[PDB]
Amino acid sequence: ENLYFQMKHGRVFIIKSYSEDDIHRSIKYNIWCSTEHGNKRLDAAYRSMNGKGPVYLLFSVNGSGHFCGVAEMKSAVDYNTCAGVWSQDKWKGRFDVRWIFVKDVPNSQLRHIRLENNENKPVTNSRDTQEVPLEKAKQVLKIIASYK
Template sequence: MIGPVDFEKSVDYWQQDKWNGQFPVKWHTIKDVPNSQFRHIILENNDNKPVTNTRDTQEVKLEGIEMLKIFKNYDAETSILDDFGFYEEREKIIQERKARRQPSLPSTGE
């Protein structure tokens, strides 16, 4: 995160509109690392469950250092960016279908 949250801006990435705001980020590394690489890391503060069974905003203490090492050293050939074209096209189709289903408002003759 390289700047503050701007709550006046929003993005249409989410199925639900309950999240608003946007903030700038600078990505240093983008790559896919399978969950299997992290399952052995157990979080005491999450009922001793694997880190792969956590939710967003879960605190990861010193185990995070091991996760960063795994992430850094994993030799990945793909990233989420490879899939953006597919998801953007799919979202475009969904929005077009929604627009066709919405009934037109009757003209008031004015």
């Protein structure tokens, strides 16, 4: 058995990226940036966590059919940074992450976990910075960690 993930202090968000380049840049430099409203959502979660648990980010390139990895948020959002570092010059700011897992996990492995906070839609049909209830996030993390 693996009873590791079955902890009550942690918050977990879906990250959608239009760009494979942004994923590569995030993995290379351990940084990320979302939309304005996505940044505010993540920043609020990171700050109210106050180091008492992780904020996990589950990354998926839009339309790709698979998740591509897992990162931990490692800083609050800096909203005034160099512009144009991502594929679109549509992102304002920067925060630190630490990539934990870089591996492709097909949506078929996860489509049966549904989100009660998002109309019971499959976790694989989430939008950018959709938050995942902790008890569903535990199931997703265990599937990602064991996939091969």
